[PDB]
């Protein structure tokens, strides 16, 4: 199609991986095969990422020196080869005659060290092997493409005599879309047997590497101590091995649940769902499966974010002031993204996958939810309003009283429920000890109570927006016929009072801001309590403490990184602090100023180009005629700028303050 504008690129890039929207993707067979191949390529990318990390650790870094003195030493991420740096004098990242290096804040050093890596040769062998695994993944993608092509050819060449041969149309993608066998093998082999295999790895490599004296592998390597070994300040490796052994056994047992290879054994998921409380749903729906997987991944990512910090599993990881914060924040952000992703894909499932029954029929869980979506949304709004009103009001009361200089006048509600739960947990742990757990129990005060209620507000409002989008995706009082329109469309016009941000994609756009806010609140809470436990406990009850003792006070090293006096190793962090501020501010433009103004401006610019003497005779403007970004395109671009600035301006701050 030669007739095109510059919006062509953005329209394509917004759905490059929306395989269901592809032209000439006739059937679910094509859809599933394309998705499988994309998955293989994704695994190849992950393996190449692992191989690159390992290679750079081996070559550009100091793993061998670090493992000798892990406590004061700092791992190297990779060298800096940037021509723009000053050549007259040494940079802050060099030893005045040495290649510039970057410190590593990913904990991969601790990971390798407690896995059992002793020499750079082992890291090199791993780099090589993971590259080979990437090759294997790509070749498997090719193999499966060929096998599925060979089945289509067969079905074309051979036909059942009876007219029911068309029934085979449904079973061509059975290997990719079968649920019982996939569940059995995933939960039994990919999870349980993988855990058992890692137990074997620990017993064979990690335990001997950690233990100075040689001792034959035996049940003595399996223990149920708890807490952190004093020397490494981490969970006993012997306990990790038992842990994984136990989980592996349990999940290997659970992996015989469904009928996978024969119909003589196992039960059916259709049958469980039919007989259970949830009536039934489109288990075949790829969007629904993606939503469930994303929800599970989000909860697991949050769990690891909390537990890696609480119970240190890696040698000397706790000693690394910066790496702990970086890991927690990283996995918290990933978890938030995965949660909002699950919600967005549930909305998409409702839009284009769910087969709604007739209105009066109420047989499925989704229909039952749609019956009282109004009640759900109203109650969620009530909870959000209560939390916001009271949290903000108590914080403002404390703010005003502190500003007037009377801390005694502050409202300080003791967290009695959380303290009782914590005391019960401590009682259980003390009983176990009589038969250390660091950071699993924390002082907990009224400031913690207020911050927890703020985080609850954030979660409730995010879920409010996402649930409203999902439950109004098919229809709404303002736009009853929303099923016909795509998942994301600009608007419905200025009629009916105006219909800005009326689509389910627009609800996601809105919930993205909240996710970022609630995640920022969580990260600020963790970082403040981590940096200054005592000051946080005493002063975190009013917002001026957050604005002064946390942001303004700890912002000094970052902004002072590079100045008229000189530069230090945080100069890069200071430049990325400002670059990300600028990106956020740019996102404000696409978020505030909308398309008509920019289309008219583009028209004027195009007029100028067409009136320019030399340029007109070469460039007509007919092909890829410039245009202003569409409404949805600009919404997304502004959201991307906002998200990039917000997310990327934090790591510089945390590194500066914790380093």
């Amino acid at each position: 199609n030669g007739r095109c504008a510059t919006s062509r690129y953005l329209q394509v890039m917004g759905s490059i991986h929306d395989i269901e929207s592809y032209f000439a993707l006739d059937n679910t067979l094509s859809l599933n095969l394309q998705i499988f191949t994309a998955h293989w390529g994704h695994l190849a990318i992950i393996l190449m990422w692992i191989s690159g990390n390992l290679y750079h650790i081996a070559s550009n870094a100091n793993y061998s020196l670090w493992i000798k003195n892990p406590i004061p030493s700092m791992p190297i991420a990779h060298n800096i080869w940037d021509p723009h740096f000053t050549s007259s004098t040494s940079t802050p990242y060099s030893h005045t005659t040495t290649a510039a290096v970057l410190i590593a804040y990913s904990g991969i050093y601790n990971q390798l060290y407690t896995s059992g890596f002793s020499t750079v040769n082992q890291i090199y062998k791993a780099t090589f092997a993971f590259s080979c695994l990437a090759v294997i993944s790509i070749l498997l993608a090719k193999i499966h493409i060929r096998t599925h092509s060979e089945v289509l050819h067969n079905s074309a060449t051979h036909a059942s005599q009876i007219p029911s041969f068309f029934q085979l149309l449904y079973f061509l993608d059975v290997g990719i879309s079968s649920i019982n066998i996939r569940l059995n093998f995933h939960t039994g082999v990919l999870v349980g047997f993988f855990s058992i295999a890692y137990t074997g790895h620990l017993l064979d490599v990690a335990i001997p590497a950690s233990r100075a004296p040689l001792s034959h592998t035996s049940l003595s390597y399996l223990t149920f101590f708890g807490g952190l070994k004093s020397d490494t300040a981490s969970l006993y490796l012997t306990d990790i091995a038992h842990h994984h052994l136990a989980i592996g056994v349990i999940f290997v047992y659970i992996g015989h649940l469904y009928s996978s290879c024969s119909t003589a054994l196992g039960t059916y998921i259709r049958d469980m769902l039919y007989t259970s409380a949830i009536y039934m749903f489109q288990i075949k729906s790829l969007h629904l499966a993606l939503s469930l997987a994303l929800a599970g991944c989000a909860v697991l990512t949050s769990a690891t974010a909390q537990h890696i910090y609480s119970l240190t599993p890696y040698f000397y990881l706790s000693y690394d002031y910066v790496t702990s914060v970086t890991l927690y924040v990283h996995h918290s952000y990933i978890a938030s993204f995965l949660a909002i992703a699950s919600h967005a894909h549930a909305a998409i499932t409702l839009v284009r996958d769910w087969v709604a029954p007739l209105e009066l029929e109420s047989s499925c869980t989704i229909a039952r939810i749609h019956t009282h979506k109004a009640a759900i949304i109203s109650h969620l709004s009530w909870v959000s309003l209560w939390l916001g009103f009271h949290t903000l009001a108590i914080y403002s009361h404390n703010d005003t009283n502190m500003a007037f200089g009377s801390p005694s006048k502050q409202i300080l509600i003791e967290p009695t429920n959380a303290q009782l739960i914590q005391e019960s947990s401590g009682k259980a742990l003390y009983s176990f000890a009589i038969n250390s757990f660091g950071s699993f129990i924390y002082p907990i005060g009224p400031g913690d109570l207020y911050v927890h209620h703020a985080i609850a507000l954030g979660l409730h409002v995010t879920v409010l927006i996402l649930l409203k989008g999902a439950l109004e995706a098919r229809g709404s009082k303002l736009m009853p016929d929303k099923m016909e329109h795509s998942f994301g469309f600009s608007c419905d016009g200025p009629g009916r009072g105006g219909t800005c941000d009326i689509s389910a994609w627009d609800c996601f756009y809105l919930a993205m801001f909240w996710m970022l806010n609630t995640n920022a609140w969580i990260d600020f809470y963790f970082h403040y309590k981590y940096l200054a436990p005592r000051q946080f406990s005493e002063s975190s009850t009013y917002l001026e403490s957050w604005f002064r003792d946390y942001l303004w006070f700890n912002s000094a090293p970052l902004i002072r990184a590079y100045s008229a006096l000189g530069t230090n190793d945080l100069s890069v962090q200071a430049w990325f602090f400002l670059l990300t501020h600028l990106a956020w501010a740019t996102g404000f433009m696409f978020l505030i100023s909308w398309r008509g103004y920019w289309q008219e401006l583009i028209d004027i610019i195009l007029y100028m180009h067409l009136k320019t003497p030399i340029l007109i005779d070469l460039w007509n403007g007919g092909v890829y005629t410039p245009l202003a970004l569409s409404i949805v395109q600009a919404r997304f671009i502004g959201l991307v700028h906002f998200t990039a600035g917000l997310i990327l301006t934090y790591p510089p701050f945390i590194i500066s303050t914790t380093s």
């Binding site: 030669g2 007739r3 504008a5 919006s7 329209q11 009853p480 016929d481 016909e484 329109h485 469309f489 600009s490 419905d492 016009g493 200025p494 009629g495 009916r496 028209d603 195009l606 007029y607 067409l610 007509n620 403007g621 007919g622 005629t625 245009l627 569409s630 949805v632």
Partner: protein, 86 residues
């Protein structure tokens, strides 16, 4: 191009036709309603997607619907002036 559809709830008041900026719509004889006429959309290729017909529709929910199709944008639906795709 966009898709302009008309449903039998139409009462033939002609407000959509009068609000059309590029004359996409026209009233046609019918027996479904008392006015004995229903708006049609023969020239949907000229529809720009302004939803002024939708704004002017009286019925409880619109008897005329404009579905936007950004993938099938043409110069007529984009209102191109400085550049020509013809």
């Amino acid at each position: 191009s966009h898709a302009v559809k008309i449903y039998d709830t139409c009462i033939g008041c002609t407000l959509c036709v009068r609000a059309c900026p590029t004359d996409v719509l026209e009233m046609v004889p019918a027996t479904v309603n008392a006015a004995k006429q229903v708006a049609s959309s023969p020239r949907v290729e000229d529809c720009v997607g302004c939803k002024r017909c939708e704004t002017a529709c009286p019925t409880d929910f619109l008897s005329i619907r404009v579905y936007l199709q950004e993938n099938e944008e043409t110069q007529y639906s984009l209102g191109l002036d400085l550049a020509d795709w013809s």
